Structure 1
């Protein structure tokens, strides 16, 4: 089961703020806000020049932790990326960005990814009409991701979909806040995203 445990601690081990909570991570409290040092009894102690390896490990752990995906699944995507034509780095990101659970989150249907995930597992999500509770489901270009008719009235749904009014969204995505529909226009360009991650090191980590 995708991690599930103290999360605003991973932010602390990566020395960078990851959004694994949506809000709370915006209001002075993602911990990174005054307490940016690693978790644990030695968190405040001076760090030692990390090994080329350490650097590469933490980088992958960053990107991977951002999407709350497992090593098993993360690796399988990367291997797929390698094989495919074109720059593995971007292509990899493109694939991570195509996970239904992620897209749900991108469209704002949920505040964080872990929430977006649950929304999927519980059928509150629809792809071209049909229900789909597979958070790893790969959204293709042209697919319409909406909210289940029966779920459109849920308290949590309104709140999030409300806050989405006026809010802009991914240049590769499009949100019709009305009927609570969204459309995966195209695979995001590396230029499209802006994750605190140097995918180049990630490729290197697996090249070892």
Structure 2
């Protein structure tokens, strides 16, 4: 269940931080800035030689950590990547982000991934019409994902609206500050929206 707890303890575990807890985990510390490097007793002993496979494994962890999910469903949908054709890992990253929770995230609706899951699961976020629960709900090229009727009347909703402006959308996430909506479009990739994890490594490790 999304680990739950010392979250940006992984902000340091992977090595380099991530937009995780939101405002703070991006403020003068994702718990980083102050002292970024893996926790634990051995916190800073003298970094050993990560076996090649383990660099790979740590990448897998890395990616699924930023994406905010257990690696079970993650496994299944990586298989779905193998099946649904395309240069596997690319259209994988795509059909990973196409998931509704972080669609809601980068659409600038939720400040952080966890917060996103809450909002979406409570049907605060509607999708092209009906208030879809399920944080795991892939959309399609054209669908307009909005919020709830009681959301224009909600608070940190307007926080998100006002404090976000001056920030451009993931070139397919066509929002609305005018009505609190958001169209879905084309499939993004490694470069449409980038992140600090080498995909090839991830896939090679995974399917072994």
Q: TM-score, normalising length from structure 1?
A: 0.96
Q: How far, CA to CA, are the matches of 2:207 and 2:129 in structure 1?
A: 41
Distance 1:56 1:108 in 2: 31
Q: Which runs of 5+ in 1 are unaligned?
A: none
Root-mean-square deviation (Å): 1.1
Look up the SS of the partner of 2:85 in the other structure: coil
- Displacement after TM superposition at 1:201 (Å): 0.5
The answer to whether the 8 A contact 2:171-2:192 is kept is yes
Question: Contact between 2:22 and 2:112, CA under 8 Å: does it hold in 1?
Answer: yes
Q: Confirm or deny: 8 A CA contact 1:173 1:186 kept in the other structure.
A: no
Secondary structure at 1:28 match in 2: coil
Q: Is the 8 A contact 1:173 1:183 kept in 2?
A: yes
Partners of 1:176 and 1:88 in 2: how far apart?
32
CA contact (8 A) 1:164 1:177 kept: no
The 4+ residue runs of structure 1 with deviation greater than 6 A are none
How many pairs align? 208
Q: Secondary structure at the match of 1:157?
A: helix
- Contact 2:20/2:30 (8 A) holds in 1: no
Question: Deviation at 1:83?
Answer: 1.1
Unaligned runs of 5+ in 2: none
Q: Deviations over 1:27-83 (max 9, x none)?
A: 112122131110111111111110012100110101000011111111011000011
In 1: Cα distance, 2:178 partner to 2:14 partner: 38
Q: Is the 8 A contact 2:131 2:147 kept in 1?
A: no
Q: Following the alignment from structure 1 to structure 2, what is the Cα–Cα distance between the partners of residues 191 and 7? A: 27
- SS of 1:126's equivalent in the other structure is coil
Are 1:160 and 2:168 matched, yes or no? Answer: no
More strand by share: 1
- Preserved CA contact (<8 Å) 1:19 1:112: yes
**Distance in 2 of aligned mates of 1:7 and 1:82:** 30
Comparing 186-195 with 45-54, greater Cα deviation is found at 186-195
Residue 150, structure 1, aligned to residue 147, structure 2: no
Superposed CA offset, 1:109-128 (max 9, x none):
11011111100111101011
Give the TM-score normalised by structure 2.
Answer: 0.96
What is the CA-CA distance between 1:2 and the residue it aligns to?
2.1
Tell me the SS of whatever aligns to 2:12.
Answer: helix
Deviates more, 1:172-181 or 1:46-55: 172-181
